Amino acid sequence: DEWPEPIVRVQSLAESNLSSLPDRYIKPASLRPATNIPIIDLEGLDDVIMARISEACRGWGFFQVVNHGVKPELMDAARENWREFFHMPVNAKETYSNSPRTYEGYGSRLGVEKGASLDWSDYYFLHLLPHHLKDFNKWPSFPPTIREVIDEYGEELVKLSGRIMRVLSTNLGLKEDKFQEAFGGENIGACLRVNYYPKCPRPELALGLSPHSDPGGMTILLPDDQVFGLQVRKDDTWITVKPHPHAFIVNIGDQIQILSNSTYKSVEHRVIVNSDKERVSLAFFYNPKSDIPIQPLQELVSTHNPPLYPPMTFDQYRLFIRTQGPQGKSHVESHISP
Ligand SMILES: CC/C=C\C[C@H]1C(=O)CC[C@@H]1CC(=O)O
Numbered sequence: 001d002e003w004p005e006p007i008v009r010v011q012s013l014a015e016s017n018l019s020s021l022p023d024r025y026i027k028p029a030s031l032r033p034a035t036n037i038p039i040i041d042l043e044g045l046d047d048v049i050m051a052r053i054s055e056a057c058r059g060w061g062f063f064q065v066v067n068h069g070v071k072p073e074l075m076d077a078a079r080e081n082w083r084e085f086f087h088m089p090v091n092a093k094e095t096y097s098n099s100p101r102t103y104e105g106y107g108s109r110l111g112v113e114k115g116a117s118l119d120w121s122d123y124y125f126l127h128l129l130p131h132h133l134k135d136f137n138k139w140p141s142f143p144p145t146i147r148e149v150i151d152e153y154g155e156e157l158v159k160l161s162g163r164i165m166r167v168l169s170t171n172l173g174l175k176e177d178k179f180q181e182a183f184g185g186e187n188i189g190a191c192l193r194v195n196y197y198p199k200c201p202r203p204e205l206a207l208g209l210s211p212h213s214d215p216g217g218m219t220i221l222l223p224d225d226q227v228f229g230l231q232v233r234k235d236d237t238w239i240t241v242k243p244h245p246h247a248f249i250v251n252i253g254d255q256i257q258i259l260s261n262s263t264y265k266s267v268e269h270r271v272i273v274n275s276d277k278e279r280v281s282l283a284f285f286y287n288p289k290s291d292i293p294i295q296p297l298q299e300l301v302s303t304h305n306p307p308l309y310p311p312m313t314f315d316q317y318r319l320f321i322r323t324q325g326p327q328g329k330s331h332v333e334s335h336i337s338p
Pocket residue numbers: 103110125191193209212214215216285318319321322326
């Protein structure tokens with residue numbers, strides 16, 4: 001219900017001209033900090049691409065899609081509307097301050113540990129589905145178009161997710177609607193988190209967002225179209241992702257890794273910052289209905305591939321990152337049954 005300490009808005013620090021980086025934002029030396037990602041042309045519906053998509057989801061846990069049915073002007077309007085929101089004076093969003101029991105609104109940290117290291121970012125969080133959680137009053141207000149751009153952007157990415165779910169299912173040799181079934185059909189969950197990474201006086205000591213995999217089903221990520229910062233990890237190597245114009249990055253989430261009995265892997269990512277420019281990225285979360293007990297699909301279980309995770313609802317699961325904040329992939333790996 002409350003934070004262990006008052007919230008410092010990272011924008012307030014960058015708007016000062018601090019000579020140093022506060023120790024709360026200095027990461028251990030062990031964890032202190034752009035390559036092309038092959039793109040998938042989506043208006044192609046059993047191609048070589050189906051092998052590539054499945055190859056990406058199994059070894060990397062992410063892929064980049066172009067020609068996906070979302071308007072490029074809508075993609076940019078979503079970014080610039082949110083960028084305008086974060087360019088507002090800090091005290092203009094303070095009334096939207098979020099709290100740890102729903103996290104909805106204007107936030108600057110994730111987790112409730114009092115001494116915990118912090119990330120160099122502010123963010124906004126809101127729900128889109130289910131409808132009893134959707135509330136325009138908990139949305140921003142200043143950019144007069146922002147709520148209409150959020151609603152349509154959310155509508156378009158819900159549609160895109162349903163189509164992506166069909167490719168993910170088929171690539172596992174399942175009925176093309178098996179994932180949509182496991183998530184709860186049409187009453188799935190959809191939320192949005194927009195991340196603001198202001199300039200950082202010593203970015204080689206800081207992280208815009210510490211390592212983690214997304215707890216939910218899949219993430220549709222719209223990274224900043226101008227500034228690099230997103231990094232994915234492949235076998236202890238942190239690789240900076242060069243964004244492709246008006247493409248999305250599709251992230252396998254923790255919930256799909258569990259459903260695929262670890263055939264699909266959830267990507268581990270982090271954000272680096274820099275001293276000279278900011279970043280704005282949009283994270284759309286497509287999640288299973290939160291009271292459905294999630295477990296490895298029975299279709300993928302043999303006696304030599306037994307189910308690797310016990311059942312757990314997404315309501316129970318999401319509290320791990322809500323209480324601890326980013327902890328890499330230790331949340332899902334501590335979920336592997338003994
Ligand atoms: C680092 C971004 C990952 C997850 C975003 C998290 C928030 O920002 C608050 C809630 C959300 C997780 C949830 O769906 O419970």
